[PDB]
Symmetry: C3
Subunit: 145 residues, 3 copies
């Protein structure tokens, strides 16, 4: 269709414009096909999950070095640790994404994880490395869409 | 078309991402197919209408309990009354949306409306109930898109 | 396609909603098919170019009176001059857009340009008129998408 082609072009341009504005003003960070954003609040794991789902997204989880660096830049920006989208398996030391799949990419701080099963959550330090920790602390809420 | 399907999927995802960011940061509230947002300014009815149309929208008007609660949450958030998108008919006590249609859903504070035709505008209290009032007061500008 | 028509309508509405929110909150200004926005930072020409490209856009450049007035309103809003997307040719007095094409629309302050080739950049005063100037000053970063 000849009109369909032009309509799609305009639609794609408008999306580029809206995403460009959000990017320019630091409202979000786009990495590949993933968009990260924070509301600036520091709350516990359960609360963060609720906030993200309310917005139509999920708690952020890095699956590549580039995504990890992006979340880390936000942690650094707000000078606060970030809870990530993963929880410990029944077997201590093993973690899984919230959908149940086993974690692949990892960036544990040397020595971590070592909570012996008592720290089922994972927090990201400002340098981007990870630490298994309890889930009741107040951490920066970072979501992915 | 095989490429049209993938293009639309990506377009829809990007929209979800941009709307998710705006939602997460409290820049807007989505209720069904309607989006509410405020610039935080408190001005009169005529001014609000101009501001909304300038942005490509219209003065907010709740047509369902869910929409009413959404606008109320914004009123509460900014601790200020909100002018709604309706004005009094020639017959006192009867109101109409700006397009001329008679108002259906209402949420008048007990006793309202009772301006006897001297208060053609409608303001929303922070608890979400309505009050007919003059149109020259300074009220939170809430628009719908 | 009967479903394609409805899908496009919804997509276009969502775009209108997201753009309406950004417009209402002063996050951007739309003029025709062009969107202008600033991150509020004041840096040199090279830095501005980087910031804009990072966001998926380019340094703003007015090509019509309407676009010029839009950028001027932003300069006025932030009370700071704005570097524009153009640089001087090898021949003093002649300027070109960054893609190499010769500038068409101009709005030089009376007497400008007169840097004799020593001021290859162009800054916009808050009244919207232009002045050729060095490229190392700190100016409001305004991008176009
Ligand atoms: Ca640990
Ligand atoms: Ca009354
Ligand atoms: Ca000069």
């Amino acid at each position: 269709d000849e009109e369909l082609q032009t309509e799609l072009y305009e639609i794609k341009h408008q999306i580029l414009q809206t995403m460009g504005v959000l990017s320019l003003q630091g409202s979000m960070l786009s990495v590949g096909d993933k968009v990260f954003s924070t509301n600036g609040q520091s709350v516990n794991f359960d609360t963060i999950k609720e906030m993200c789902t309310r917005a139509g997204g999920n708690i952020a989880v890095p699956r590549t070095p580039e995504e990890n660096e992006a979340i880390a830049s936000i942690a650094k920006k707000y000078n606060n640790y970030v809870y990530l989208g993963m929880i410990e398996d029944q077997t201590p030391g093993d973690f899984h994404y919230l959908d149940g799949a086993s974690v692949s990419y990892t960036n544990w701080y040397p020595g971590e994880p070592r909570g012996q099963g008592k720290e089922k959550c994972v927090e990201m330090y400002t340098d981007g490395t990870w630490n298994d920790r309890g889930c009741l602390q107040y951490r920066l809420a970072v979501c992915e869409f």
